[PDB]
Design a protein around this motif. Sequence first.
Motif, mmCIF file in Angstrom:
data_model
loop_
_atom_site.group_PDB
_atom_site.id
_atom_site.type_symbol
_atom_site.label_atom_id
_atom_site.label_comp_id
_atom_site.label_asym_id
_atom_site.label_seq_id
_atom_site.Cartn_x
_atom_site.Cartn_y
_atom_site.Cartn_z
ATOM 1 N N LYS A 182 0.812 -1.210 0.000
ATOM 2 C CA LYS A 182 0.000 0.000 0.000
ATOM 3 C C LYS A 182 0.853 1.270 0.000
ATOM 4 N N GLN A 183 1.916 1.295 0.809
ATOM 5 C CA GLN A 183 2.829 2.436 0.856
ATOM 6 C C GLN A 183 3.439 2.749 -0.513
ATOM 7 N N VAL A 184 3.891 1.720 -1.218
ATOM 8 C CA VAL A 184 4.418 1.873 -2.569
ATOM 9 C C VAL A 184 3.345 2.460 -3.514
ATOM 10 N N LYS A 185 2.137 1.894 -3.495
ATOM 11 C CA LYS A 185 1.035 2.417 -4.322
ATOM 12 C C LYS A 185 0.713 3.878 -4.005
ATOM 13 N N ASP A 186 0.554 4.171 -2.712
ATOM 14 C CA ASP A 186 0.250 5.527 -2.224
ATOM 15 C C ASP A 186 1.320 6.544 -2.640
ATOM 16 N N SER A 187 2.587 6.148 -2.526
ATOM 17 C CA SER A 187 3.707 7.031 -2.884
ATOM 18 C C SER A 187 3.779 7.310 -4.388
ATOM 19 N N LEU A 188 3.580 6.274 -5.183
ATOM 20 C CA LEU A 188 3.594 6.444 -6.630
ATOM 21 C C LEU A 188 2.463 7.393 -7.078
ATOM 22 N N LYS A 212 0.729 9.727 -4.966
ATOM 23 C CA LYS A 212 0.832 11.055 -4.350
ATOM 24 C C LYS A 212 2.009 11.865 -4.862
ATOM 25 N N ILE A 213 3.136 11.208 -5.130
ATOM 26 C CA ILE A 213 4.351 11.901 -5.547
ATOM 27 C C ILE A 213 4.502 11.948 -7.075
ATOM 28 N N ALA A 214 4.282 10.822 -7.748
ATOM 29 C CA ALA A 214 4.469 10.730 -9.204
ATOM 30 C C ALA A 214 3.189 10.859 -10.020
ATOM 31 N N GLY A 215 2.031 10.876 -9.363
ATOM 32 C CA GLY A 215 0.749 10.896 -10.068
ATOM 33 C C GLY A 215 0.416 9.621 -10.814
ATOM 34 N N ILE A 216 1.029 8.502 -10.441
ATOM 35 C CA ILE A 216 0.811 7.246 -11.139
ATOM 36 C C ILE A 216 -0.196 6.413 -10.347
ATOM 37 N N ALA A 217 -1.313 6.088 -11.000
ATOM 38 C CA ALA A 217 -2.375 5.261 -10.425
ATOM 39 C C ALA A 217 -2.610 3.955 -11.185
ATOM 40 N N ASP A 218 -1.979 3.776 -12.345
ATOM 41 C CA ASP A 218 -2.351 2.704 -13.285
ATOM 42 C C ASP A 218 -1.225 1.703 -13.584
ATOM 43 N N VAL A 219 -0.220 1.655 -12.717
ATOM 44 C CA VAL A 219 0.864 0.704 -12.867
ATOM 45 C C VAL A 219 0.708 -0.397 -11.836
ATOM 46 N N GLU A 220 0.930 -1.632 -12.267
ATOM 47 C CA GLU A 220 0.828 -2.786 -11.391
ATOM 48 C C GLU A 220 1.939 -2.759 -10.335
ATOM 49 N N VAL A 221 1.540 -2.820 -9.071
ATOM 50 C CA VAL A 221 2.482 -2.992 -7.953
ATOM 51 C C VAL A 221 2.164 -4.346 -7.364
ATOM 52 N N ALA A 222 3.074 -5.304 -7.515
ATOM 53 C CA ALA A 222 2.840 -6.655 -7.032
ATOM 54 C C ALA A 222 2.841 -6.646 -5.505
ATOM 55 N N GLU A 223 2.240 -7.676 -4.909
ATOM 56 C CA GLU A 223 2.226 -7.790 -3.455
ATOM 57 C C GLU A 223 3.666 -8.026 -2.996
ATOM 58 N N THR A 224 4.033 -7.365 -1.909
ATOM 59 C CA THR A 224 5.390 -7.425 -1.368
ATOM 60 C C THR A 224 5.831 -8.871 -1.152
ATOM 61 N N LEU A 225 7.021 -9.213 -1.633
ATOM 62 C CA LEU A 225 7.584 -10.542 -1.440
ATOM 63 C C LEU A 225 8.062 -10.672 0.004
ATOM 64 N N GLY A 226 7.495 -11.650 0.695
ATOM 65 C CA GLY A 226 7.706 -11.830 2.105
ATOM 66 C C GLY A 226 8.792 -12.834 2.382
ATOM 67 N N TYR A 273 10.746 8.130 -20.328
ATOM 68 C CA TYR A 273 10.654 6.771 -19.768
ATOM 69 C C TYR A 273 9.259 6.498 -19.211
ATOM 70 N N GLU A 274 8.798 5.264 -19.369
ATOM 71 C CA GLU A 274 7.524 4.824 -18.833
ATOM 72 C C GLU A 274 7.744 3.759 -17.750
ATOM 73 N N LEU A 275 7.148 3.982 -16.582
ATOM 74 C CA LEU A 275 7.166 3.007 -15.490
ATOM 75 C C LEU A 275 6.288 1.835 -15.908
ATOM 76 N N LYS A 276 6.862 0.634 -15.951
ATOM 77 C CA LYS A 276 6.157 -0.570 -16.404
ATOM 78 C C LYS A 276 5.614 -1.417 -15.263
ATOM 79 N N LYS A 277 6.427 -1.619 -14.235
ATOM 80 C CA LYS A 277 6.057 -2.519 -13.139
ATOM 81 C C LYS A 277 6.955 -2.302 -11.945
ATOM 82 N N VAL A 278 6.423 -2.679 -10.787
ATOM 83 C CA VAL A 278 7.073 -2.493 -9.505
ATOM 84 C C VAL A 278 6.876 -3.752 -8.666
#
Length: 453
Positions: A98-104, A106-120, A426-431
């Motif tokens: 969620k922090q990664v999604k929220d930061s992307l 709020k800071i970068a204006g990116i809402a439409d890039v896939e952020v995978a669930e954190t690897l535990g 550059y285009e952000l593809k995935k995180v």
Amino acid sequence: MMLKKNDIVEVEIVDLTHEGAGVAKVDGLVFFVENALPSEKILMRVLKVNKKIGFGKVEKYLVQSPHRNQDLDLAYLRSGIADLGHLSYPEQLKFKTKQVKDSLYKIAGIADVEVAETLGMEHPVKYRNKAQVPVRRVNGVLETGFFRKNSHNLMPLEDFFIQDPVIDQVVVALRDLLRRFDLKPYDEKEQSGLIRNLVVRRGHYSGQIMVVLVTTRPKVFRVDQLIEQVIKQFPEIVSVMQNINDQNTNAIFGKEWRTLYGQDYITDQMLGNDFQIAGPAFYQVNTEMAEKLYQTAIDFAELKKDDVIIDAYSGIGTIGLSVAKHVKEVYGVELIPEAVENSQKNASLNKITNAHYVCDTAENAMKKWLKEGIQPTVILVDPPRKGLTESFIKASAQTGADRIAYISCNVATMARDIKLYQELGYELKKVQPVDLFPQTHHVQTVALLSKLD
RNA sequence: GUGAAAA
Ligand SMILES: Nc1ncnc2c1ncn2[C@@H]1O[C@H](CSCC[C@H](N)C(=O)O)[C@@H](O)[C@H]1O
């Protein structure tokens, strides 16, 4: 309402900050409350009222979170060792995602890039391969421990929870030797004493130990006897270093390093290769998870035999040297002489002759390589928390590298930097977030950016 | 300025 310090007010916690503090909203103020989780209902004691924010403390829990970990020793929360340790591990992972999604957003204006669930991590404890432990006098006694958050008040500890348990044992043995020999702890207030810190690094696979005595002065009363005793207790110690830090600085290490015993490096493995590691060199502190992080970055980068890789912020060379035999050329930049010297040696150890390092700042090296006409197809960056400079970003984007893999331990600076990369074609593809720091609020990510044309 | 890391 007009709240003041010491008021008791009933609140519901509705969010967590990036640092793991509970958030409540009362009378137009946003309150931050330690050890309070979303959906918890508390009596909150007001500690401090500012203009738009306040700070509160849990006076009484009325309803606790179903995700609360009841078993956490609060010493670990207060010392900032495990500032998310009061949350169940699956929910720690969801928070980090969620922090990664929220930061992307709020800071970068990116809402439409896939952020995978954190690897535990499968067993998310006892993982650190390094401890940097202060030594201070507390109630007249020489103690090892950790600072209470937002302070230099040392909380004595022997079990550090998230450290290699052998490191915990080494630190205790050293503490007891320092007491036995009556060596004096550093006093920041009085600018006196000898022993500032004990640093202990232990190879995750190799088990090889380096001890560093961080001192205010060269001369240490009977250090030869101290070394004799500690190596007897721990035969895996291959190195005892001294670092001399005579300044009033919160930086742990000063400039001067001396070998008191054995080698000036340990050797450990990552992704099946050997790496020599100096005391002042960086080494990812969770090797098990750092291997997975690296593998993610490599997978993202879709490396080919003709690729020319820049490994920026390369340290001891782990990332570039893990891929060198599968690509045409690796160029690395690392600021710390001891670390880049490790990387040079490490290339040679692993029979790699297509890896080329420079000792410089990343922005200087990028400008120089751009001038020389180096033609990188892939740029991998792994900066410290502060992230990249704008000059580095602009220079890197002028190479026309088609893939950039950004490895980050601070999603706020990564998102800022990603926003600039997006302005430069550059285009952000995935995180993919990876849990390098379990039980803490810290999030590690790898992001893939690719050139639009 | 490095899990904590005050002034
Ligand atoms: N401005 C700068 N230019 C180049 N290197 C820098 C820098 N600031 C910090 N560093 C170095 O950046 C590294 C970040 S740690 C990452 C190191 C390596 N990629 C690994 O995975 O192990 C450290 O080795 C640090 O000394």
